[PDB]
Amino acid sequence: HLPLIAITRNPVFPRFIKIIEVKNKKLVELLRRKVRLAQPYVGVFLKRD
Amino acid sequence: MQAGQRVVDNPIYLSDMGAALTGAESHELQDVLEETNIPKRLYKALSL
User: What domain notes does the record hold (chain B)?
Assistant: First the structure.
């Protein structure tokens, strides 16, 4: 139950470890707000052209 | 400046930057700058 993430030119193929490095620091706010939750998780989606 | 970041907003500059690594004499550079078509300059830059 989280708002969509900013893929920003980064393909994450199924069952293929990948790294994401956005230059903006606002997505880190969402990554630190999930630390108190019991299970922390995130979804990965794809962008259009 | 990676090819996977899609940050190459100016491809002409990327092809020129790649041709800049060539050690060819200045004349070759001038001749490549004279080239107007795109496959010729890419083909020649690769040749250099």
Answer: The Lon N-terminal domains are crucial for the overall structure of the protein, maintaining it in a conformation allowing its proper functioning.
- Between CA B26 and CA B32 the distance in angstroms is 10
Q: How far apart are CA A14 and CA A30, in angstroms?
A: 23
Residue with tokens 């969509």: A4
Q: How many other β-carbons are positioned within 10 Å of the β-carbon of residue A9?
A: 10
What resolution in angstroms does the PDB record give?
3.8
Contact by Cβ (8 Å): B36, B9: no
Neighbours of B32 (CB within 10 A): 19
Residues of A with Cβ-Cβ distance to B4 under 8 angstroms: 9
Enclosing H/E stretch for A24:
none
